[PDB]
Amino acid sequence: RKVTVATCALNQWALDFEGNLQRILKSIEIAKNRGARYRLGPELEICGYGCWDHYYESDTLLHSFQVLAALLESPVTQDIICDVGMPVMHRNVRYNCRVIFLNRKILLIRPKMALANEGNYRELRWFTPWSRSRHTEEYFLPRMIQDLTKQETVPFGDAVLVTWDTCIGSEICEELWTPHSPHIDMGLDGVEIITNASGSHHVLRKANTRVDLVTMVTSKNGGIYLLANQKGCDGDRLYYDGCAMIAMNGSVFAQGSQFSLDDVEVLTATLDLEDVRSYRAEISSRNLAASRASPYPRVKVDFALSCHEDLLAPISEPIEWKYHSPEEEISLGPACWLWDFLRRSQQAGFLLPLSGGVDSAATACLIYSMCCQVCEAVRSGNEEVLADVRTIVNQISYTPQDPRDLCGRILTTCYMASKNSSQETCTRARELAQQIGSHHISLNIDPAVKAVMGIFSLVTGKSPLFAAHGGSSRENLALQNVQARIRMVLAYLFAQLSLWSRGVHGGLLVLGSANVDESLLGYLTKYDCSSADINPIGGISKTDLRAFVQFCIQRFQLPALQSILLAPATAELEPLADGQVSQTDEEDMGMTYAELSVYGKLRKVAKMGPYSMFCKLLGMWRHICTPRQVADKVKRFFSKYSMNRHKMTTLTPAYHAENYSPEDNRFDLRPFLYNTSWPWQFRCIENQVLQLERAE
Amino acid sequence: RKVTVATCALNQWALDFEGNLQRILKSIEIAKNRGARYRLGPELEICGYGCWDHYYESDTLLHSFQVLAALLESPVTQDIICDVGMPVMHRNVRYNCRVIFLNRKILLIRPKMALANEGNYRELRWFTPWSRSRHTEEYFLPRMIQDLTKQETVPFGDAVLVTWDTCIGSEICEELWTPHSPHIDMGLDGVEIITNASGSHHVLRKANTRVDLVTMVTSKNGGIYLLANQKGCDGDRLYYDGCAMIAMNGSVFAQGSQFSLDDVEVLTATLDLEDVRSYRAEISSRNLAASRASPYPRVKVDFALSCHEDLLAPISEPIEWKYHSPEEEISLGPACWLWDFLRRSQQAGFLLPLSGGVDSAATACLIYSMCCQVCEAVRSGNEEVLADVRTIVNQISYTPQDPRDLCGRILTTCYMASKNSSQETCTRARELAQQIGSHHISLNIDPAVKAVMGIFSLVTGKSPLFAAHGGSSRENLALQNVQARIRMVLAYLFAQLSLWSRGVHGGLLVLGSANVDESLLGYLTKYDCSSADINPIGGISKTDLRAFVQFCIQRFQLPALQSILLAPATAELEPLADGQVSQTDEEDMGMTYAELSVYGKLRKVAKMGPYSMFCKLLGMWRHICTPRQVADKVKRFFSKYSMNRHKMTTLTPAYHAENYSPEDNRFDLRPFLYNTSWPWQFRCIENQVLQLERAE
Amino acid sequence: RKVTVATCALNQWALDFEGNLQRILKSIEIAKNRGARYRLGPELEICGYGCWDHYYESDTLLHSFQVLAALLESPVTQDIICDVGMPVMHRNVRYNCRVIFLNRKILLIRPKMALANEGNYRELRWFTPWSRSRHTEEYFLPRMIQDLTKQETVPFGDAVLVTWDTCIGSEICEELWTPHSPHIDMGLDGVEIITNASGSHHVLRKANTRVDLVTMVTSKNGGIYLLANQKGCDGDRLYYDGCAMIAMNGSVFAQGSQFSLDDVEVLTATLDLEDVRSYRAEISSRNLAASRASPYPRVKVDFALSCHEDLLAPISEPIEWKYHSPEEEISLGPACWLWDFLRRSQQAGFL
Ligand SMILES: Nc1ncnc2c1ncn2[C@@H]1O[C@H](COP(=O)(O)OP(=O)(O)OC[C@H]2O[C@@H]([n+]3cccc(C(=O)O)c3)[C@H](O)[C@@H]2O)[C@@H](O)[C@H]1O
Ligand SMILES: Nc1ncnc2c1ncn2[C@@H]1O[C@H](COP(=O)(O)OP(=O)(O)OC[C@H]2O[C@@H]([n+]3cccc(C(=O)O)c3)[C@H](O)[C@@H]2O)[C@@H](O)[C@H]1O
Ligand SMILES: Nc1ncnc2c1ncn2[C@@H]1O[C@H](COP(=O)(O)O)[C@@H](O)[C@H]1O
Ligand SMILES: Nc1ncnc2c1ncn2[C@@H]1O[C@H](COP(=O)(O)O)[C@@H](O)[C@H]1O
Ligand SMILES: [Cl-]
Ligand SMILES: [Cl-]
Ligand SMILES: [Cl-]
Ligand SMILES: [Cl-]
Ligand SMILES: [Cl-]
Ligand SMILES: [Cl-]
Ligand SMILES: [Cl-]
Ligand SMILES: [Cl-]
Ligand SMILES: [Cl-]
Ligand SMILES: [Mg+2]
Ligand SMILES: [Mg+2]
């Protein structure tokens, strides 16, 4: 009848065994206080999901087991079934596993059967899928575990648990949406509870597909579904957004946070198993298509999941899943990201080159949002967060209440004007900093620039001129770039010495402000301020950035943003001749951010090369453009793209948000020395155009 | 009786279909002129091996076929069997394939059955292995091919080719390295000739493994074995080093270049099939197993490998494989990789910061080596090299004979001294430049440094001091780093404007000079000159570098190097107080380049975390060090490594040389925000140390 | 973790049982003193490889067993696993065998599955290949052995050895050179250490082939690989040139002499089993095939290859194989072959 189960989101850290252990323990202790008899944790939670090439290392395996032993001998784990994740090597093959134990015995080790090998995922690099479906083998335990557990071997493979009162089965992360998912046969076999341990990272706007899936599955097959997921940054450019859930028969009973500053969040629910049994009768109490397939092996477990609590235990009522707006998503994720980055880097704060333009502004807003979250958290009684703030600012007695106050201690904004900067942009940056609370620095680079160009003249005997002073296209560009790069040099100097100049220990993380759209076209200066330490908006669309900044006005009460939004998007690096005004980035690029986004998505999402893309747009923009015209747009896109790709190889690491990122380290593997005339492809395009231009 | 076969190495280029088509045609034409009736190409040669995520694009598939259709309708391919590679989608699964055609008819498509998923390889990201052994399906041909070939379908799978006189089998690359390789069962079923198309890249010293393996195989199994490989840079960090070979019954019959400036290099041999047959007939255990061997599907082909060429057509005689010394390898690999960048980037030359030290010196030697190579190639009658040069140099009449004259056209060294630089280092740089013939630039950064520091003072009211002037540790470092990044600002300014100042069109690629040992430890300044466009020595050991440079003294007649070798490895950026001499980078790092090299190899090559590494060293350095000491060495390494790993994320792409490269984009994936205290792991280490101190 | 293993080259002599016995004992004693818990010998080392038509003689079989019984009751062989070779008649078929024993108990008898029948070799004249792959029969022990060992039978066939810490397989000589060698399927089924007892003779310039092959194998397949061989003249035209080796994951860890005037030369190495395991764990195509691999019969053994030696027992470091020039080979081969004639012919010199 009535059972009480727990799932959870943990902020795990790659190879951080000590912390990882304490987090797992805490969740189990929490679940037990709430009356749970089964606890589900995230995929590979013992070592942290993102260990990458450390999985090749045997030490990883070893410590994981030492962590497992600690769990097994811990008095908290008594009388609750615990499903943890670690790597495990069986017969010289490395598997991504679930280790399920109860009262100092291992019940079953259950290896993953479908591995993620797309986008940021590459599990086949380190793990093998279990291929012997509906079968188990005897796994031989480490003497370390034997001595403790008093078992020689345990079942290893595709099996389910049978207890005195129920039948629980495992579905690991992506097995949930893999063709022919375990949950189908488990359902058929009569499995009433299905646990899914995830490690899925944030992706702007796609939170609902996870929820929908679990929902549909429970709706279609009946049953309780448990989903646990990592939450936070585990040591790289991903943010895991654990929307841990508990679903039954198509309804949701517990909704876990997508972004929060909690290291441990536990969901429970009290459900009557008979609701499953009667909901399944409601559908098909009959037989099926006559399948006669090999049935699931069964691990007998001497334990009752439901135990006497009924007399008081309130049944969980169904709930509606509340989603975040896309702007709320943006204001929360990169924000919580930046918080883990700061706290785990053990760095003294951030250094933000603030230009008075939209992106640098958005970046500033993310920090302010971070501060708010921290204040919220501290108010909420979050000891970990309080501990951390106190450690970051060095003040034992400190207690952030006003976000502007915390911000000041944590953020240093820096406006670096050139000879041609307007008074307006300088002002806007000054105002925005004033409003969020940051320590603002305003300086002029021109003395350093004059000096560099002096060195050049001194040695070549030649003086480059700006385009407006009769300079060549090359000279103009070079000059612009020098200023860009001097800014970067200065940014790092302050990162390294500004706190020093204020009488205080420590150094700052440099933050970048490239957006995903310009990153793709390479419309940036190699090694200017586009290269920093971390970039939180690197993966966000320009349009979304504007959207996010306009949303910040009212949510954070920052009026300084209006002028910033209204101002013309221009880079004041070159003097303006009489009769003309500044050129906008969109004219500079030779395409609007809108249409740039389309190329982006057609390229990475829809997997189109130039010919394919030419054909798509030809129809999409059939009214607006002519065949010759789209050819030119596409050609212009691919050439600029290819010419600039090398800029991508060295680009600052970015929070992952859009599934159309051009990021080269993990998500978008590509050449960087292309033939930039695309002779063959472009010829195909021409032929098509010529063919169409034969119509009357 | 006698058959004439060809294999080759092509300098393919990712997505360069036009180019790739022309090079394949050339190989086939060269093959025919030399009398071959079979021609084998490299792995995925139509599209070029390294298209990475473009493999997801239908356009890659489509254009590959268009190339194929071109090959099929081409007169040159008449009466020679052609083994060509491309990706194929079959039943909506994407495979790495060989396509064998003859006289406008596709004979068979052979999919790869084992993929490479380690190191720089990750075929599983985009392809699936064919897994039905000795089995075949019908491939439905694209309409375009049908209209040309008048075929509806062709066999797709694990099949062999039967001619009137022989039986030909395919082994694709990594299949040769798998435990139960195809060549075993193939040889037992009477396949006489085995063809292997590879696409494997350079690794210092590992050339013999490929040779020994193919030789062993034909020795153990009998038969002729052909290997083809890409040669050169196809668009990324890798150099494919085509050691294409022909081997029979354990002897080599043709050895292809490892590094050469040739786009197309064809090997042919004339062999007697009767030698194969009698070699096999002499192995009793083989024959006992061959009269019981499981059969391969055979595609019957109306063709004779041995024609009316028999008339005294001279049988090929056995040869000894000649190898390169490790220094010759270094002298030739990155050199060719550099030529390929220069010509395929359509850039006007290189800009090399030259410090008067070993590594930058090495980089200079590579460029000179390249120059010699180009000169040698031109003297050989190589028309594409001569064209390529004239294009780079914009003078259609130019003929590089002297290596020093070419060098001055395409290289620009740049010495950049600080206030503290010594006169010696200046002169070493200058003397090296004179001797290789580069255009040398000598300047002082001090004016620019003062200007930047003046900016900092104007805005903070504080002035940083060098440690020798009582500055703090941080001040001293900030100061050193500033100078360092200023050098980078200048480097790019000259890269962009130096030719302009000399009244010449174009720009330069900036070369880096980070070695693989410093890259590992993070012993470099983020965004100093460590950050360039490409780094030809970023994957090479400090010890190999010295060895290389010392080799260059006699090989290239460059005496300036001796002083460069003999001089103390010091970075003159800070002033030294008297009573004290300048600190070497080895005491700066806190470890010798030697012990560093060991950490790096134990790390990547032996897959070792800090506990494992401590254990290994403890035994290795048992005489030299005490366990307490070993722990400190290991902890210091791991500490430094992980505090600095972020420097890897934005670091300049390096030519891949060692298999212990710490490169983060492809070869060595790792997190970049570690818990740098390594609590768990260091605890385990201290436990062992205590345990060892108590007992004895 | 770390295991210490031994292999050797013995100057055996056809039918010189007394002598052959003493040399085997010496190797095992040398092995134990150097800390090994496993000792591999050369092919047919009890009787000496080149007995030729004496293999037809029951006496060869009988006396081989008497030697074996001697080894079994010998104190020196306590607590080390010994791989020793002799011919065995089983169900009235004569096989070239490895006999593995431990502490007065025979663990398994592994018959040769491919014989050499070319050049100077002609094993088919006197032996039969074992042809039931991954299969085992009961060998009925001779009474003499039963009374000593208190065993009635022992497994006879294509089986592997499982200890507490590891899995050991046999490849006999020419099996390494066959197309579908045992080491392939063995490595996929988790055999960590492969032992090879050979008896192959000198051929000018061909030494590298043996080295390259064993190296290639452990490179491609992972694992430790031990090779033993006779060294010297056993009674005829041939000189066995024992290039005994120890190799792991594609590197050599011990190189034995090709020509030397030593009767017994033992190689030991100390290796970490964890290095094998992680080397294999890094090969995706291998692991995809290993999770689908057909199983070998296993003889369970109540023994640990890795003992309380772990205490700073120094791991063996990789070495480069040093070869002889063709002239050094000529200078050394026939020279040793000559010393062996002189001393074994009990003659006073040469004319
Ligand atoms: N295939 C290839 N592989 C490797 N490297 C390659 C290469 N092709 C060129 N390169 C090299 O890469 C280097 C590129 O860097 P660099 O020479 O500095 O120039 P680059 O970064 O290419 O040009 C900067 C761009 O930024 C834009 N801009 C201007 C002003 C402000 C802003 C802003 O929004 O902040 C942007 C401007 O319109 C311009 O197109 C060159 O040295 C070039 O030789
Ligand atoms: N976990 C983490 N994730 C992301 N970023 C992290 C981080 N931890 C620190 N950071 C940040 O990274 C930045 C590091 O750069 P920066 O502050 O400039 O300093 P950094 O590059 O760390 O220090 C430079 C090193 O170069 C050496 N050096 C000196 C002189 C000459 C030479 C030579 O051979 O050329 C070398 C010197 O001994 C020193 O150790 C800092 O802003 C820091 O806050
Ligand atoms: N005036 C400025 N002050 C501070 N940072 C700037 C300034 N201008 C540009 N940046 C930085 O440079 C990048 C944008 O380049 P740009 O479009 O030329 O303004 C972003 O990473 C900005 O943070
Ligand atoms: N005096 C110099 N002139 C030109 N390049 C230098 C100089 N010093 C350092 N570099 C560059 O900076 C890196 C080495 O840093 P450092 O060890 O401080 O000399 C290499 O990439 C060099 O090319
Ligand atoms: Cl163990
Ligand atoms: Cl069952
Ligand atoms: Cl400090
Ligand atoms: Cl803007
Ligand atoms: Cl804007
Ligand atoms: Cl200090
Ligand atoms: Cl130009
Ligand atoms: Cl040096
Ligand atoms: Cl040096
Ligand atoms: Mg903006
Ligand atoms: Mg140097």
Numbering used by the authors:
A (entry chain A), B (entry chain B): 3 to 698
C (entry chain B): 3 to 353
Paper text:
Here, we report the structural and kinetic characterizations of hsNadE and a direct structural comparison of the closed and active conformation of (1) hsNadE structure in complex with a synthetase intermediate analog at 2.84 Å resolution and (2) tbNadE structure in complex with glutamine, sulfonamide derivative 1 (5′-O-(N-(nicotinyl)sulfamoyl) adenosine; SFI), and PPi at 3.14 Å resolution. Both structures are snapshots of the enzymes in the allosteric state with the synthetase active site loop ordered revealing an exclusive rearrangement of the glutaminase active site and the molecular tunnels.
We co-crystalized wild type hsNadE with NaAD+ and AMP (the synthetase intermediate analog), and MgPPi, which activates the glutaminase activity in hsNadE by 12-fold, to obtain the crystal structure of the hsNadE in the closed conformation of the synthetase active site and with the activated glutaminase active site. The co-crystals of hsNadE crystallized in needle-like shape diffracted up to 2.84 Å resolution. The ammonia tunnel is also sealed off at both ends and the glutamine-binding pocket is inaccessible in hsNadE. In the ATP-binding site of hsNadE, AMP and MgPPi are bound in a deep cleft as reported in the tbNadE structure 27 with one Mg ion coordinated to three O atoms of PPi, to the main chains of ATP-binding site residues including Val360HS and Asp361HS (ATP pyrophosphate fingerprint), and a Cl− atom (red sphere). In this hsNadE complex, the ATP-binding site is fully protected by the closure of the P2 loop via three crucial contacts with the ligands and with the synthetase residues. In addition, this conformation of the Glu176HS side chain blocks the glutamine tunnel and clashes with the glutamine molecule as shown in the overlay with the tbNadE–glutamine–SFI–PPi structure. Interestingly, in hsNadE Trp179HS-subunit A is observed in a conformation that restricts the entrance to the glutamine tunnel, and Glu176HS is positioned to prevent glutamine binding.
